[PDB]
Amino acid sequence: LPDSVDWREKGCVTEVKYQGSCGACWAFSAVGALEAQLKLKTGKLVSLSAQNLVDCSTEKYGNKGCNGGFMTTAFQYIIDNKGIDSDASYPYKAMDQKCQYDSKYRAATCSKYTELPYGREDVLKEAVANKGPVSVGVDARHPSFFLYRSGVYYEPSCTQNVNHGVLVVGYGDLNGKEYWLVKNSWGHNFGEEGYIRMARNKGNHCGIASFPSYPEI
Ligand SMILES: OCCOc1ccccc1-c1ccc(F)c(F)c1F
Predict the structure, then answer these.
(1) How far from chain centre, in Å, is Cα 131?
(2) CA–CA separation, 183 and 168 (whole Å)
(3) Which of 76, 161, 166, 180 has the fewest C-beta atoms lying within 10 Å of its C-beta?
(4) Rg of the chain in Å (alpha carbons)
(5) 163, 168, 185: residue to mutate for ligand 1 pocket, most atoms within 8 A of CB
(6) Using an 8 Å Cβ cutoff, are 169 and 101 in contact?
(7) What are the residue ranges spanned by the domains of the chain?
(8) What b-and-e string marks burial along 66-102, b requiring 16 or more CB atoms within 10 Å of the CB?
(9) CATH class of segment(s) 1-217
(10) Residue of the nearest CA to atom 13 in ligand 1?
(11) In the UniProt entry, which residues are flagged as the active site?
(12) How open is the CA angle 38-43-47, to the nearest 5 degrees?
């Protein structure tokens, strides 16, 4: 595998989004993963509607809108629904709304998704290299997370109990520290223009490889 990957370089990552006071990280993680696949398949980079997932991938999928959800079940909704609308057509409001999905605004489909084996950072590396960005959960509870600015994030108090959905868009090494390149959804003010480099091959640090998944068109 390549020693480093950055899907931003391949034009497969949309602008960082801002979830506000709505726990829609899972929806941003899911659409991020699918956006990459849509670029790979069609050559067009298009932001997909996190709001569509918040409003429409609801109780049947075990999701709770602004109070949390699962990336995998979001993928299944997109499969079941035979599409997801673009962000432009179905914009993000940081609140729970009625389902307003319309196929005339469909910007992507999903045929399947894959869940990677628990805690296997080597398998995650392979997927990020060979498949695309991968949806993951991380333990983002610790005060240091919110205050991250640079370098490679390592928090001794981190656990594998994940609480925040994010997107792995790459990996590498910076000054001798291996990292996962993670796109967050707290706007470009967070971290490095909305990204955080998180420790890689350090014992499934912060649970980053606990629950990875990626969709396919
Ligand atoms: O904005 C993200 C907050 O997410 C919440 C909120 C409430 C209950 C659960 C979760 C939650 C936990 C883990 C994870 F990987 C998720 F993607 C995820 F949504």
Answers:
(1) 14
(2) 6
(3) 161
(4) 16
(5) 163
(6) no
(7) 1-217
(8) bebbbbbbbbbbbbebebbbbbebbebeeeeeeeebe
(9) alpha beta
(10) 163
(11) 25, 164, 184
(12) 45
Nearest to 8 by CA among 201, 126, 172: 172
Q: How many CB atoms lie within 10 A of CB 132?
A: 26
Resolution in A: 1.6
Compute the distance between CA of residue 174 and CA of residue 159 in angstroms, rounded to an integer. 23
Cβ partners under 8 Å of residue 9, min gap 6? none
Tell the residue nearest (CA) to atom 9 of ligand 1: 68
Q: Ligand 1 centre from 213 Cα, in Å? A: 15
Beta-carbon contacts of residue 63 (< 8 Å; ≥ 6 apart): 26, 53, 57, 69, 70, 73, 74
Residue type, 157: S
> By what technique were these coordinates determined?
X-ray
Q: Which two tokens stand for residue 67?
A: 């109070």
